[PDB]
Ligand binder design. Structure first.
Ligand SMILES: *SCCO[C@@H]1O[C@H](CO)[C@H](O)[C@H](O)[C@H]1O
Ligand SMILES: *SCCO[C@@H]1O[C@H](CO)[C@H](O)[C@H](O)[C@H]1O
Ligand SMILES: [Ba+2]
Ligand SMILES: [Ba+2]
Lengths: 394, 386
């Protein structure tokens, strides 16, 4: 309402999703369209993205939650963010062009994990400040969602003109804006509080129950398959458009409009989830997941691929809250700590290391639409197996 | 549009007016409110400010224009700017508190002239880069005006909390930002003694000089310590700087908006009338400040400074352009606008500073408001006709 720390972190949510909004959606276009990198090479890039995510994400889930609460980690993340443009334009870009991809990927994910493994730890850090004060994390998260939307259109429109200055703008937002939010720093009943910790015996007891294994199979079979599908979908999407400018213009307009569609539906989504149930609503996401990949295998027009892109926005709430309420309804509260780590974060990244290579090589071999039928078949395949992930009903 | 040197120098306009926006408007408040310096002492500080300006400004007008074009001078200015905070917090601040003002003023203006005499030379150096390329100086100067406005509100709001870190921010802005702009690296006039001697032969200069000394210097001195007088009308110490921060920021947006449409007015009214209009609004503010009673009344007096500026910037330009030979313009700016104004401001700052200690702010404001309006009435007859 008037909380001084609220604006400190509300703008921090906005100015981080500014740099997040610049990098992530326009990352594959910057590799193929701009850096002229092949489909197999991009497959190697995204495999290394998932590898550093598998290493750094569990390290931050133990740090930020326990010792990291003293703002030390958040400064390190900002230290990398300050040198956003003098990395892509000066270090990252030429290392890829050097034709040695193996040498290049290592140095590439060192600044890459600040968004992949970095963001959940930053979102967990602002989750703690919101619980300490009056302001709610839900309204604080929405402050940043507009920053993701504002950039997506601005980068999409200004890309073909000069992508170099949009990168040169993001680094500045981490420099002139992020530091200002850092110098001005820091009996209670919480509405939602997750003060959890994990151990080897907690994980060993989690391995005793088959519930985890059937859940893991959905995370690997369906989710990882779909997550890999989106890694290089942008290049396939842009191809359907009249010009090179027409591709990025519409792709910029879609992620911006899609975010407003996502937040609007994610709002009314818990009402639906509670009536459908955790298992059934999770499978609702799996159908709208696989229908997009399998629909992409027969894609013919530009307005047809626009309709396919929006499906991703109908999918997200039924999997964000869908995964939450499943663990909440089918697992002990104490186990939730290992669950996110073991399945949601470890098994998903391990599957995404190999799946990204195989699909990346499939675009080089059988093409986009060719690979989409293979991945669309397996995602729908595991979705049909997920109907009987507990016991055979009657 | 896409000029690589435009962004390298447009941001240079922004990040300099960042440090300019920190120092200049909040300089008197840092002396009286913070350093606890008297009105007579501040009068001595501003006299030394005008003395180093009278010495360094003519030296840079000959350097940057001729030899200085090889970026050597711009590097020296940045060398002082890097040590902005380790000067005010470490050297300048204690020297004043060492209750020896004479010893302190000398060392104070060595970094002080980097903004007073420094800025016109920086604005002239960048005027040359704009002339060399596609991008225009008019749009490049505006790039920096937002930097002056962004800081003014940020310093005004954060001052009472910790003024030490805002100073610690400006020095870094010259360090991490200005150096990066250095790795990535028409008025062609000259002046002489005979040009200046031919200038003294014509009475036009003397009548113009009298307006620059009588009216302008009087008004410029008035603003040197007005901020302290303004902050007094406000509910708290926080209320003074908050509104003073909001006013210079809003006033800049009001100034740029009106200076845009101003040349249209000037060309219809004439050069003399533009100066006569600027002088009336100048003296009315000073004389109005002598009877000031409320906080929203002083806010209205502060905005009048923003109504005045275009009628004197372009007002002075078109007068020389319309009543003097193009060759003479080089000396004109040095002789009256820069030398006579600073010489008058050396003594006027001492006398007015001593007047606040003697007859107070409002008291001094009637003496200065009477003379400024006095010279404005004589400028109706003295100044060269339209
Ligand atoms: S750490 C949160 C970032 O996740 C992304 O958030 C944006 C904008 O808020 C969109 O919701 C994307 O779908 C998420 O991947
Ligand atoms: S070299 C600049 C001196 O002029 C001042 O510039 C600031 C920043 O834009 C404002 O225009 C002030 O009104 C001027 O005094
Ligand atoms: Ba949570
Ligand atoms: Ba000029």
């Amino acid at each position: 309402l008037k909380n001084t720390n609220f604006w400190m972190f509300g703008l921090f949510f906005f100015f981080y999703f500014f740099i997040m909004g610049a990098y992530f959606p326009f990352f594959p276009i910057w590799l193929h369209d701009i850096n002229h990198i092949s489909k197999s090479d991009t497959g190697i890039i995204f495999a290394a993205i998932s590898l550093f995510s598998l290493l750094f994400q569990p390290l931050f889930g133990l740090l930020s939650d326990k010792l990291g609460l003293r703002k030390y980690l958040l400064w390190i993340i900002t230290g990398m963010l300050v040198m956003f443009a003098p990395f892509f334009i000066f270090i990252f870009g030429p290392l890829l062009q050097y034709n040695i991809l193996v040498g290049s990927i290592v140095g590439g994910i060192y600044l890459g994990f600040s968004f992949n493994a970095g963001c959940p730890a930053v979102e967990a850090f602002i989750e703690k400040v919101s619980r300490r004060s009056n302001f709610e994390f839900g309204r604080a998260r929405m402050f940043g969602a507009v920053g993701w939307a504002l950039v997506a259109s601005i980068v999409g429109i200004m890309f073909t003109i000069n992508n170099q200055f949009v990168f040169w703008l993001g680094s500045g937002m981490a420099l002139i804006l992020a530091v200002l939010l850092f110098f001005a720093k820091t009996v209670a009943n919480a509405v939602g509080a997750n003060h959890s910790a994990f151990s080897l015996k907690l994980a060993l007891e989690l391995f005793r129950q088959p519930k985890l294994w059937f859940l893991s199979l959905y995370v690997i079979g369906v989710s990882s398959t779909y997550d890999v599908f989106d890694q290089q979908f942008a290049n396939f999407f842009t191809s359907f458009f009249a010009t090179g400018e027409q591709g990025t213009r519409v792709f910029g307009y879609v992620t911006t409009m899609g975010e407003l569609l996502n937040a609007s539906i994610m709002f009314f989504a818990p009402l639906i989830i509670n009536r459908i149930g955790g298992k059934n609503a999770l499978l609702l996401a799996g159908t709208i997941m696989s229908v997009r990949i399998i629909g992409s295998s027969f894609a013919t027009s530009a307005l047809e691929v626009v309709i396919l892109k929006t499906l991703h926005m109908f999918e997200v709430p039924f999997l964000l809250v869908g995964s939450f309420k499943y663990i909440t309804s089918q697992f002990e509260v104490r186990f939730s700590a290992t669950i996110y780590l073991v399945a949601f974060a470890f098994f998903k990244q391990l599957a995404m290391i190999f799946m990204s290579v195989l699909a990346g090589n499939m675009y080089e071999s059988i093409g986009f639409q060719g690979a989409y039928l293979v991945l669309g078949l397996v995602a729908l395949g595991f979705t049909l197996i997920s109907v009987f992930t507990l016991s055979g009903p009657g």
